[PDB]
Amino acid sequence: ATAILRPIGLHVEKFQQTYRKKWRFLTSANANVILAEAASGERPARWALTTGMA
Amino acid sequence: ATAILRPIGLHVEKFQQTYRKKWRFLTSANANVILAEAASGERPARWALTTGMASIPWEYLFFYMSPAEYNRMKNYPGTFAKSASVRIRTWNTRVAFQTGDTQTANATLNQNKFLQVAKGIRSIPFICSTNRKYTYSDTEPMQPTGFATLTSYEYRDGLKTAMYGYDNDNKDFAKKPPADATGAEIYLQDYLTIYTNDARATTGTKILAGFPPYKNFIEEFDASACINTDVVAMDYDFSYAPLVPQFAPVPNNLITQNYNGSYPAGTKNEVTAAKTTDSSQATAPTQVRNAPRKYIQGPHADTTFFDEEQNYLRVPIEQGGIFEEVNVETVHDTQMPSINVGIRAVPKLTTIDETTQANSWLDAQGYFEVDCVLTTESVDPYTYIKGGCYSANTKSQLQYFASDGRPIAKVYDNPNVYGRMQMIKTVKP
Amino acid sequence: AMYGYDNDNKDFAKKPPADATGAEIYLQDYLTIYTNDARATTGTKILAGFPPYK
Amino acid sequence: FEEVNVETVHDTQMPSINVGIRAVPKLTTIDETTQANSWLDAQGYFEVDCVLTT
Amino acid sequence: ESVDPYTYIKGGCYSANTKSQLQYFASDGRPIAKVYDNPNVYGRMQMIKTVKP
DNA sequence: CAGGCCAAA
DNA sequence: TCGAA
DNA sequence: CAGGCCAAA
DNA sequence: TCGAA
DNA sequence: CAGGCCAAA
DNA sequence: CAGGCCAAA
DNA sequence: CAGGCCAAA
């Protein structure tokens, strides 16, 4: 029995794209210093310890 | 030495899409009858010989993509149709047991059934045939007796309407259900016609050659043994077929004063040339460069053709020679083969008093399943950092334009000249 | 149509039991595809037509 | 239907079987490019064997 | 990745019903989205209303 | 290419 | 183990 | 033995 | 490399 | 054959 | 020892 | 991945 028609489904077309970038970053070596942050609104007063990793 | 950077070039993204359709066509077996066509304007008086092979419109875009696919394809600039393919298979051919006439009909179980196929008739220099629609007689539905007023554009529009239905808001929506949805058949009504000069009104010297033997250029098969068989299989790689204009490049006039500078092309022909010929031999052929043309994208774009969608069903997909690129290129004229298929008329069993062809014919219909595929490609350059896609300057495209503003395009409906297609102004829809 | 009527029914002679006779049963329920009728729609319209159910 | 037993439940449905013969166009010619205007009568013959286990 | 359905014959691309997408919205109309700038709670990100540019 | 979506598997 | 693998 | 001619290849 | 070998 | 049911595994 | 916890894997 | 365009080879 020859099949003139078959369930070929929908004609769905799928596209793929890729994006490449190269960046150069300069980061300073900050000291580890304790800074006082005042309370404001919902934020309570807290001590802050900075770190040099960007 | 480590390389932190390398010439990675541009970020060009290429998309490929394919479109598949399956159509069922019914073609009647017209008789071979000579019809007189009166002279009108530039057309001289001519005798017309009808033939029963219906044409397969595989050179047009609606044959491959639905309106939704075409509307979405409009959103991808730089869309070039790379290839097309068509396969025609034949099913059981039907022949009437007996016609409406009953006094002399002589119904018969036995039947002779022949199928004619033509592939290169349109490109033959001397045949000068064309595709026409007839008006059949009441007593003999297989005997044409004239020509219908429907042009090729109207015929293709009606065929597309039969294929894809109407809009939901149209009042005639209930008339023609979508064949692409139902799987029904579509009666083909455009058939081949051979032509010859009508010497009756000619004054002076006359050409009395008659019709050319066009039967020597067509295949013919026994339709009884062709049940469920592949008859036609054609592939066509398009030389140049821009469906959507390329991305508009960044103009160099806003940056550099050098934009108008010239540069030597050498002996190479960088500009396409139009050739005008006269088959009446009253004037020698002429080749003209710098033909009137204008850009199809950019600051001074003229997108009349694509806005009019002439390439959907009014103009064939293949448009080589029409479109020029500013890139260092080579261009040659291109055309597509013409597929004609149909059943030969079956003579009635009644006897004939004199030696001549059949006077009456049995009704017949051929059943053709057509599977068509169209493959296209698209490009997005991403040349500049901001402001969307822009293409390179060398990718700028121009199209031939008439002095009155109408673009010039190929048409396959007119008969060929010198085995070549003819350029003509597009007509506004 | 498949199983006939009860013996006390007046219409018992109309439809013999197909399970007993082996006769056929004409089917009368067929599939129907649907699409929106945009003729009376006011404002934006959906003009997609029928889906390719084939 | 739910049970008081510690259970897992998911929605269920059955496939729909549709079978039938396509209409046969009449041999008469048609003046314009469109589908068939008249059709020959046709009937398909289907033997269905069904089993249910409980 | 991208997808074009071509579900219907005419009128451009239309997707299936099951592909319909909803987004969380505040009672005032501003959509809700993830932000990685605020500190985590329970090792989890926090949903917050987007601010109009 | 039918059973809770298919363009997922 | 509300298919069933 | 169909695509810019075929009687050319 | 406006088919394509 | 006992632990979120057993007539399920 | 980075992705909805780590002292679980 | 430079020489008459590159997203063609």
Coordinates of C-alpha atoms in Angstrom, one line a residue, chain E:
Chain E
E1 CA 18.2 29.7 19.8
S2 CA 15.1 30.8 18.0
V3 CA 11.9 29.1 16.7
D4 CA 9.4 30.0 13.9
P5 CA 6.3 27.7 14.0
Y6 CA 4.4 28.4 10.8
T7 CA 1.4 26.8 12.4
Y8 CA -1.3 28.4 10.2
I9 CA -1.5 28.9 6.4
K10 CA -1.9 32.7 6.3
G11 CA -1.1 35.7 8.4
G12 CA 2.4 35.1 9.5
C13 CA 3.8 33.0 12.3
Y14 CA 1.6 31.7 15.1
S15 CA 2.7 29.5 17.9
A16 CA 0.9 26.6 19.7
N17 CA -1.4 27.3 22.7
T18 CA 0.8 25.3 25.0
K19 CA 3.7 27.7 24.3
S20 CA 1.9 30.7 25.9
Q21 CA 4.1 32.4 28.5
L22 CA 3.2 34.4 31.6
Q23 CA 5.4 36.6 33.7
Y24 CA 4.9 37.6 37.4
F25 CA 3.5 41.0 37.8
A26 CA 3.1 43.2 40.9
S27 CA -0.3 44.6 41.9
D28 CA 0.8 48.0 40.6
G29 CA 1.7 46.8 37.2
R30 CA 5.5 46.6 37.4
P31 CA 6.9 43.2 36.4
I32 CA 8.9 41.1 38.9
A33 CA 12.4 39.9 38.1
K34 CA 15.6 38.5 39.6
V35 CA 18.4 40.7 40.8
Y36 CA 21.9 39.5 41.9
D37 CA 22.9 42.8 43.5
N38 CA 21.1 42.3 46.8
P39 CA 22.5 39.8 49.3
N40 CA 21.0 36.4 49.3
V41 CA 18.4 35.0 51.7
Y42 CA 18.8 31.4 52.6
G43 CA 21.3 31.0 49.8
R44 CA 18.6 32.1 47.4
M45 CA 18.1 34.9 45.0
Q46 CA 15.4 37.5 45.6
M47 CA 12.5 38.6 43.4
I48 CA 11.9 42.4 43.1
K49 CA 9.9 44.8 41.1
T50 CA 11.6 46.2 38.0
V51 CA 12.1 50.0 38.0
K52 CA 11.2 52.0 34.9
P53 CA 14.4 53.4 33.2

